[PDB]
């Protein structure tokens, strides 16, 4: 009572029925996993930039 | 006792030679591979003929044995034992597997089928191609008729079609008759006990000088 065990038949067709579309792209990708020491700087850096621009445009 | 040869006529599996992984093989029937006046010089046997394959098959060591024995014995009986140099050009290195099964009446109680049907070695064979030489013979031009007939009588032991060809080369060298002749009349050919060495244009000069002296003695 054996049973045919494994094969990839028709898998390619079954996949390509719907696209293998590229994942996506964006401005401003996720920052998870980047060097936290760098993140800590970068946050205060933007903070300072924004404050300076607000005070200048005031 | 021996399964008929038609069960191993083709090349059906990848080469499976004896090695540290096989470790249990029988011995090929063929042990003597060069026959005749093998200590002959290069230059006394200019004529050379080949028994060439025209197929793609496997040859049993037993078949090689039978052909070698028949051809050698004829060549001796007619032309004298020292009128030729005969050589095989293949070697049985492919092991042939067999799945030994019980052959008694009522073995249905014991045989176990192909469940776990890996084979067991029982015979050697050599794989041969289209255009590959099997037998090579060299002798004097006066014996072309006898040697070619010996080879023809030999083909009958091999399965399939094989031709007999008269090589335009001198002896077993890689040279044709006139080229070898001129090269030998010039000094750059020095015989060895069985084969011959060739003076090259490269190498350390004095080392070339110590041999081949007459060539430089121009």
């Amino acid at each position: 009572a054996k049973s045919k065990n494994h094969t990839a038949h028709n898998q390619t067709r079954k996949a390509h029925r719907n696209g293998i579309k590229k994942p996506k792209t964006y401005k401003y990708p996720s920052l998870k996993g980047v060097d936290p020491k760098f993140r800590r700087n970068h946050k205060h850096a933007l903070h300072g930039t924004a404050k300076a621009l607000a005070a200048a445009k005031k | 006792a021996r399964r008929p040869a038609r069960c191993y006529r083709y090349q059906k599996n990848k080469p499976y030679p004896k090695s540290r992984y096989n470790r249990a093989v029988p011995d090929s029937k063929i042990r003597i591979y060069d026959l005749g006046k093998k200590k002959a010089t290069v230059d006394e046997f200019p004529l050379c003929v080949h028994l060439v394959s025209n197929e793609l098959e496997q040859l049993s060591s037993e078949a090689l044995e039978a052909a070698r024995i028949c051809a050698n014995k004829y060549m001796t009986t007619v032309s004298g034992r020292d009128a030729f140099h005969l050589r095989v050009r293949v070697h049985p290195f492919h092991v042939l597997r067999i799945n030994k099964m019980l052959s008694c009446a009522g073995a249905d109680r014991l045989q176990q089928g192909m469940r776990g049907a890996w084979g067991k070695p029982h015979g050697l064979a050599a794989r041969v191609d289209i255009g590959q030489i099997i037998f090579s013979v060299r002798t004097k031009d006066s014996n072309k008729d006898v040697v070619v007939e010996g080879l023809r009588r030999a083909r009958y032991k091999f399965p399939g079609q094989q031709k007999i060809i008269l090589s335009k080369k001198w002896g077993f060298t890689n040279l044709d008759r006139p080229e070898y002749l001129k090269k030998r009349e010039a000094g750059e050919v020095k015989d060895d006990g069985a084969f011959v060495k060739f003076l090259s244009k490269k190498g350390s000069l004095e080392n070339n000088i110590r041999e081949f002296p007459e060539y430089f003695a121009a």
Binding site: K14, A15, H16, N18, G19, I20, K21, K22, P23, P29, G33, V34, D35 | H50, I165, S167, K168, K169
Partner: protein, 159 residues
């Protein structure tokens, strides 16, 4: 039974080279990697630390992170009927710039310079590349080059 380790079936893939074993020449570490560089991955069997898994052999990605002695890379892997982005951490040894961009930026800067110098006389710079056009008409003379006639060859055994 069956077997799938972390480094299975890599016996040839990870061999170093012929005649190139031993330490690594320093240029590799003297390289400098910026965020956004496009980089190829070639494993180096001498440094077991921070290797890439065999699947990422020979692939190409974009750097996104930099640390004291390693690099973060982004790869797109085809699993099932979509692509998923994987993030890798690799020591600088299995890494080298893909000079595709190195040459591409050359084209871009030369392109801009060409556009500007052409605009200096307003002459329709004609930027885009072209595939290999079919070759043009031409005349062939036979002076000292009389046509030579061939013919097929007969047959002999050549042995």
């Amino acid at each position: 039974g069956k077997s799938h380790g972390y480094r299975s079936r890599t016996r040839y893939m990870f061999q170093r080279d012929f005649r190139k074993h031993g330490a690594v020449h320093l240029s590799t570490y003297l390289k400098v990697y910026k965020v956004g560089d496009i980089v190829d991955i070639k494993a180096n069997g001498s440094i077991q630390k921070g290797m890439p898994h065999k699947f990422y052999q020979g692939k190409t990605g974009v750097v996104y992170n930099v640390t004291k002695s390693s690099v973060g890379v982004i790869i797109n892997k085809m699993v099932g009927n979509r692509y998923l982005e994987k993030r890798l951490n690799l020591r600088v040894e299995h890494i080298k710039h893909s000079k595709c961009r190195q040459e591409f930026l050359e084209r871009v800067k030369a392109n801009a310079a060409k556009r500007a110098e052409a605009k200096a006389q307003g002459v329709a710079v004609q930027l885009k590349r072209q595939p290999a056009q079919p070759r043009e008409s031409r005349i062939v003379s036979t002076e000292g080059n009389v046509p030579q006639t061939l013919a097929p060859v007969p047959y002999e055994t050549f042995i």
